Amino acid sequence: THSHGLFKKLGIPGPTPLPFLGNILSYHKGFCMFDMECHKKYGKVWGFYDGQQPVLAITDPDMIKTVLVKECYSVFTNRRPFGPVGFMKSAISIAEDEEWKRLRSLLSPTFTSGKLKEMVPIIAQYGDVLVRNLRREAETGKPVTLKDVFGAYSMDVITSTSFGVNIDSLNNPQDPFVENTKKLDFLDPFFLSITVFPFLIPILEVLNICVFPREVTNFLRKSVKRMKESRLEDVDFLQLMIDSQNSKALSDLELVAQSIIFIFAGYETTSSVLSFIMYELATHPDVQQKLQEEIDAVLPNKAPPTYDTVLQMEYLDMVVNETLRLFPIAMRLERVCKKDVEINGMFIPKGVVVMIPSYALHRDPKYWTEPEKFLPERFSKKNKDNIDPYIYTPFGSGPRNCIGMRFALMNMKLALIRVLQNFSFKPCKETQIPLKLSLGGLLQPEKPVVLKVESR
Numbered sequence: 001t002h003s004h005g006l007f008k009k010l011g012i013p014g015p016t017p018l019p020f021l022g023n024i025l026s027y028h029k030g031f032c033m034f035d036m037e038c039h040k041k042y043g044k045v046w047g048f049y050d051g052q053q054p055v056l057a058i059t060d061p062d063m064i065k066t067v068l069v070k071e072c073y074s075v076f077t078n079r080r081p082f083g084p085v086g087f088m089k090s091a092i093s094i095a096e097d098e099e100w101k102r103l104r105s106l107l108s109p110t111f112t113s114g115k116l117k118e119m120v121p122i123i124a125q126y127g128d129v130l131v132r133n134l135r136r137e138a139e140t141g142k143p144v145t146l147k148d149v150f151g152a153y154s155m156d157v158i159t160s161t162s163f164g165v166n167i168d169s170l171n172n173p174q175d176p177f178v179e180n181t182k183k184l185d186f187l188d189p190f191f192l193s194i195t196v197f198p199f200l201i202p203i204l205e206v207l208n209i210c211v212f213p214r215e216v217t218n219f220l221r222k223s224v225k226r227m228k229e230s231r232l233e234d235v236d237f238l239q240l241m242i243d244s245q246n247s248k249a250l251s252d253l254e255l256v257a258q259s260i261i262f263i264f265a266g267y268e269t270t271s272s273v274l275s276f277i278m279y280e281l282a283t284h285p286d287v288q289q290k291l292q293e294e295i296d297a298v299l300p301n302k303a304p305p306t307y308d309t310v311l312q313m314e315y316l317d318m319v320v321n322e323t324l325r326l327f328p329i330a331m332r333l334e335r336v337c338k339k340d341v342e343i344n345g346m347f348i349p350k351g352v353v354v355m356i357p358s359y360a361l362h363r364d365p366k367y368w369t370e371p372e373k374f375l376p377e378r379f380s381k382k383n384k385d386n387i388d389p390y391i392y393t394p395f396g397s398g399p400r401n402c403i404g405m406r407f408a409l410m411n412m413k414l415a416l417i418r419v420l421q422n423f424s425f426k427p428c429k430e431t432q433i434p435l436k437l438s439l440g441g442l443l444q445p446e447k448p449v450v451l452k453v454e455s456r
């Protein structure tokens with residue numbers, strides 16, 4: 001509470017913090033509601049406290065460009081630490097300063113479009129698996145829980161595109177590989193405690209207690225070392241990383257850490273976003289029909305999608321983009337200010353976490369007409385030019401943006417094309433309309449999305 005005078009000293013408005021807790025009791029309706037309320041009450045900048053940690057929210061696009069792009073290497077290089085991580089210190093998304101810059105360099109060629117284009121046939125084959133599993137539920141007119149069927153698909157693409165492991169996870173839900181990979185919210189009892197007692201992280205570190213379950217990581221560390229020495233010697237991210245350390249080059253533990261970070265990144269996020277898209281499509285049947293029409297036009301006779309035909313589909317892009325406006329699953333972007341700086345006329349002291357409230361800026365009425373409405377036309381080739389890339393930031397911006405952005409969009413778009421070539425999706429009576437968001441620390445629905453699936 002001796003850090004609680006900072007924003008008052010700088011003349012920055014904000015909610016008044018409680019001793020020890022700072023402002024965290026205000027998270028009782030989730031990050032997103034608190035961000036919106038603060039933006040409304042206070043304006044273009046505000047300040048609050050995760051316990052003793054000061055967080056400065058910013059909403060000026062010039063200033064957001066300074067933090068995310070212009071001054072990224074110099075000042076704003078790292079996100080805030082969040083819990084004991086053990087050897088996952090070395091994952092690209094956790095690493096800092098020159099170690100991150102090194103790993104970002106080492107893994108960037110892995111995510112080029114050319115490498116992605118070679119991944120498309122592997123991503124395509126489990127679209128086919130996705131359809132047959134869905135068709136089994138559509139012929140037995142039982143409502144479908146999207147998270148399970150899409151989770152199984154996302155998991156299927158990951159195991160294949162990252163290790164070559166080919167599993168029908170939905171029907172082998174309990175293969176040892178699928179078990180570890182699925183398993184284990186910054187507003188759960190643990191992480192709030194860490195925010196009130198962030199002195200306790202080094203405690204857990206010397207104790208080898210890790211927020212990554214130690215059994216999953218132990219399983220994958222040894223799984224990788226088997227794969228590595230079965231390929232060595234006798235198309236996936238592991239090969240791409242194995243070829244990279246065939247040179248400063250990627251250590252062996254370092255390689256495992258990135259493998260682990262890739263698996264989750266796209267397990268729950270791809271799965272989650274595909275469900276938000278199928279919700280919107282089901283409650284906006286005209287948007288759905290217009291997409292089936294575009295897909296049939298570009299790929300007649302249920303022609304298999306290809307890398308090039310996917311980038312041909314403009315309405316598909318508009319649907320994806322608009323969904324990520326309403327549900328940017330990151331919610332906020334964050335960088336720690338490593339040096340006293342003054343950017344766009346505002347002094348920022350060292351150690352402040354600077355925060356871009358994406359969810360709140362994606363639903364700002366001052367940049368978006370009817371911002372709560374699902375309106376893909378916002379992203380039409382005509383109107384797309386009028387959208388500020390520092391207000392709409394579903395993948396971040398700048399040198400620390402989502403390295404997997406192009407893979408994710410291609411992964412999800414192949415997912416939707418195949419599924420819409422063969423099915424229409426319709427609300428049930430058990431479908432939650434309007435969808436309510438979870439009051440927790442994740443951007444996800446209050447209730448899981450359930451929809452009726454009919455065969456075309």
Ligand code: HEM
Binds near residue numbers: 092093397398404409
């Ligand atoms: C719909 C899917 C996804 C969305 C919306 C998304 C969004 C984001 C966002 C908002 C960030 C923070 C960017 C920033 O701080 O400016 C991020 C970081 C990151 N994402 Fe994604 N992401 C997605 C999928 C993926 C996938 C499939 C991968 C596959 C490897 C991935 C890997 C990463 C990595 C490694 C980082 C950290 C980048 C760094 O620290 O250098 N993400 N993502």
Ligand SMILES: CC(C)(C)OC(=O)N[C@H](CS[C@H](Cc1ccccc1)C(=O)NCCc1cccnc1)Cc1ccccc1
Binds near residue numbers: 093269402
């Ligand atoms: C989004 C937020 C900050 C509100 O709560 C978080 O969950 N904490 C993020 C870590 S998320 C997840 C956690 C994890 C899981 C397994 C191993 C290590 C870490 C993770 O693997 N993260 C990196 C890849 C990723 C995640 C989501 C989207 N794209 C890529 C901090 C963070 C959040 C989003 C992007 C980058 C970092």
